[PDB]
Amino acid sequence: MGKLTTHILDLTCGKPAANVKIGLKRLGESIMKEVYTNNDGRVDVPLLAGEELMSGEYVMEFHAGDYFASKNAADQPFLTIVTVRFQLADPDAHYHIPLLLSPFGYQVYRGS
Amino acid sequence: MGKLTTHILDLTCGKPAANVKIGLKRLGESIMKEVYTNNDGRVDVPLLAGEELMSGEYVMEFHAGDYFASKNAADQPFLTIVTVRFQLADPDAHYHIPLLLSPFGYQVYRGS
Amino acid sequence: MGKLTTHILDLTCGKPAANVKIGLKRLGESIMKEVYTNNDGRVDVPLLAGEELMSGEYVMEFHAGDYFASKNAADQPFLTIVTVRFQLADPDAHYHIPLLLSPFGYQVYRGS
Amino acid sequence: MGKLTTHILDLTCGKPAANVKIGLKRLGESIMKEVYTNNDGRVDVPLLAGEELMSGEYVMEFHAGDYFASKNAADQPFLTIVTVRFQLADPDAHYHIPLLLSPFGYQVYRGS
């Protein structure tokens, strides 16, 4: 009954980051899912839920470079893929892990 | 003549994070360097400089889980290894990429 | 039809900050409202809405010192009242201004 | 022998914020100092030091609205004056309180 969700805010304009590609994958393995955020900078279905969600480490790859490119911007951006590693210990908990994005800085947190 | 440096601040106590292990590696490759921060949460020599520093993507692995463990704390911490991917376009520039750390959230930025 | 809301996350434990007192006031004036966050670190009714919400500057006073005290902590905390000034230009917009809190650092943003 | 310093980073471009006006004042009182950051987003002399630095609360007013205006931008910016309240308990300590700035979000912390 666990759940893993995320949301992206573009601090450069104060609006959610729409159409940003996000990749999910277990630590060590390769991509298992690829999603694109909607207009509220979220995704309809949880990135992980039910059986899918198992205790262990994961990595989310936020394609920030592409997002900011479609908004402007260097040919070789400082931030290309924002990588976020974290561990989900409880398989039945609700994990909200938002991302606050700027061209040269970001904030990751266990939201509510 | 380029340079890559970093520094860690523990927002939980307002002091620099001392003795935190940091791993550096080119995107795709495995670890190339392993360092431990001093008492000011920095390292004597730049993580990258001179020939070592070449245009491309890198990843720094901050061992936050171990750091907070030695300071407290769950057996399976939410944040184990804080992964930071970024691209260094100019081989002759000075890149300062600090990390502001908390048990359930962190901030990455291109400092000065 | 405008709306102003906020939410507090305690990055020290990854849970919303419950029962934190928040003060609202127009720039220059004294407090106009005093609220305490619920268990999700939010408040039932918007801090501002309808006629109440008028174009101009405001200030929110998050009583962080008291919150962390009830959770531990210095007699004279570094952060006592986290002050957040901002301007609401459009009286009919929806403003979400969350606060990510830690004992020695915080993040303010125009969320969604 | 205490010291209070600060530094501003513009996360929108990864460069320090130059020529930003900063106001200092004791809680309750009006401005006591007004400074403008140099090209490294800092100021030559500490904002507070020696006798000047006394245990108590202070407030720094970062004129972000003007800074971003000279860089672009709404006539009525969301962030006009970023207000930062904090308490200095020890008169002989070194307090570094940097600001990570973006148009719609900022991070305040007790740096090193």
Side-chain angles (χ1 to χ4, degrees):
Chain A
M1 66 181 88
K3 183 206 299 295
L4 166 65
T5 65
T6 182
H7 176 192
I8 312 176
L9 285 300
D10 176 350
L11 300 184
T12 282
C13 60
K15 301 296 179 188
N19 225 187
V20 184
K21 199 216 303 186
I22 303 178
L24 211 213
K25 75 186 188 183
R26 293 201 156 75
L27 199 289
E29 269 147 281
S30 38
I31 269 65
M32 84 166 70
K33 295 187 188 193
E34 278 174 290
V35 180
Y36 298 78
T37 54
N38 56 36
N39 295 304
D40 190 282
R42 314 197 176 207
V43 305
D44 284 64
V45 179
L47 260 47
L48 231 48
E51 292 185 59
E52 290 193 300
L53 206 164
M54 307 190 282
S55 60
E57 290 182 73
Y58 295 82
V59 183
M60 291 188 283
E61 318 195 312
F62 298 90
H63 295 256
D66 291 336
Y67 167 67
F68 284 123
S70 79
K71 289 271 298 178
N72 222 303
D75 302 290
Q76 302 291 192
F78 172 63
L79 299 180
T80 58
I81 302 300
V82 174
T83 189
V84 176
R85 194 212 277 215
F86 54 89
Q87 177 166 204
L88 305 184
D90 186 336
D92 306 305
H94 282 46
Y95 300 90
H96 297 289
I97 310 179
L99 173 67
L100 299 181
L101 188 60
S102 287
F104 298 80
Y106 60 94
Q107 163 91 49
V108 165
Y109 65 106
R110 173 79 135 64
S112 180
Chain B
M1 66 181 88
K3 183 206 299 295
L4 166 65
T5 65
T6 182
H7 176 192
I8 312 176
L9 285 300
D10 176 350
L11 300 184
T12 282
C13 60
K15 301 296 179 188
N19 225 187
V20 184
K21 199 216 303 186
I22 303 178
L24 211 213
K25 75 186 188 183
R26 293 201 156 75
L27 199 289
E29 269 147 281
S30 38
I31 269 65
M32 84 166 70
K33 295 187 188 193
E34 278 174 290
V35 180
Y36 298 78
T37 54
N38 56 36
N39 295 304
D40 190 282
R42 314 197 176 207
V43 305
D44 284 64
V45 179
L47 260 47
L48 231 48
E51 292 185 59
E52 290 193 300
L53 206 164
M54 307 190 282
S55 60
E57 290 182 73
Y58 295 82
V59 183
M60 291 188 283
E61 318 195 312
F62 298 90
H63 295 256
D66 291 336
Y67 167 67
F68 284 123
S70 79
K71 289 271 298 178
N72 222 303
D75 302 290
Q76 302 291 192
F78 172 63
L79 299 180
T80 58
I81 302 300
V82 174
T83 189
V84 176
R85 194 212 277 215
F86 54 89
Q87 177 166 204
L88 305 184
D90 186 336
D92 306 305
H94 282 46
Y95 300 90
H96 297 289
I97 310 179
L99 173 67
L100 299 181
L101 188 60
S102 287
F104 298 80
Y106 60 94
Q107 163 91 49
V108 165
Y109 65 106
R110 173 79 135 64
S112 180
Chain C
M1 66 181 88
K3 183 206 299 295
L4 166 65
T5 65
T6 182
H7 176 192
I8 312 176
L9 285 300
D10 176 350
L11 300 184
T12 282
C13 60
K15 301 296 179 188
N19 225 187
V20 184
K21 199 216 303 186
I22 303 178
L24 211 213
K25 75 186 188 183
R26 293 201 156 75
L27 199 289
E29 269 147 281
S30 38
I31 269 65
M32 84 166 70
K33 295 187 188 193
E34 278 174 290
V35 180
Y36 298 78
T37 54
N38 56 36
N39 295 304
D40 190 282
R42 314 197 176 207
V43 305
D44 284 64
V45 179
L47 260 47
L48 231 48
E51 292 185 59
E52 290 193 300
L53 206 164
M54 307 190 282
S55 60
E57 290 182 73
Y58 295 82
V59 183
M60 291 188 283
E61 318 195 312
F62 298 90
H63 295 256
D66 291 336
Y67 167 67
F68 284 123
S70 79
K71 289 271 298 178
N72 222 303
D75 302 290
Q76 302 291 192
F78 172 63
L79 299 180
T80 58
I81 302 300
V82 174
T83 189
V84 176
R85 194 212 277 215
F86 54 89
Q87 177 166 204
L88 305 184
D90 186 336
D92 306 305
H94 282 46
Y95 300 90
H96 297 289
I97 310 179
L99 173 67
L100 299 181
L101 188 60
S102 287
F104 298 80
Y106 60 94
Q107 163 91 49
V108 165
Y109 65 106
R110 173 79 135 64
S112 180
Chain D
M1 66 181 88
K3 183 206 299 295
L4 166 65
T5 65
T6 182
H7 176 192
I8 312 176
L9 285 300
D10 176 350
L11 300 184
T12 282
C13 60
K15 301 296 179 188
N19 225 187
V20 184
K21 199 216 303 186
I22 303 178
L24 211 213
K25 75 186 188 183
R26 293 201 156 75
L27 199 289
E29 269 147 281
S30 38
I31 269 65
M32 84 166 70
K33 295 187 188 193
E34 278 174 290
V35 180
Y36 298 78
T37 54
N38 56 36
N39 295 304
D40 190 282
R42 314 197 176 207
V43 305
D44 284 64
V45 179
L47 260 47
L48 231 48
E51 292 185 59
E52 290 193 300
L53 206 164
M54 307 190 282
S55 60
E57 290 182 73
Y58 295 82
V59 183
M60 291 188 283
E61 318 195 312
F62 298 90
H63 295 256
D66 291 336
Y67 167 67
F68 284 123
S70 79
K71 289 271 298 178
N72 222 303
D75 302 290
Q76 302 291 192
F78 172 63
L79 299 180
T80 58
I81 302 300
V82 174
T83 189
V84 176
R85 194 212 277 215
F86 54 89
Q87 177 166 204
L88 305 184
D90 186 336
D92 306 305
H94 282 46
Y95 300 90
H96 297 289
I97 310 179
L99 173 67
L100 299 181
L101 188 60
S102 287
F104 298 80
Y106 60 94
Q107 163 91 49
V108 165
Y109 65 106
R110 173 79 135 64
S112 180

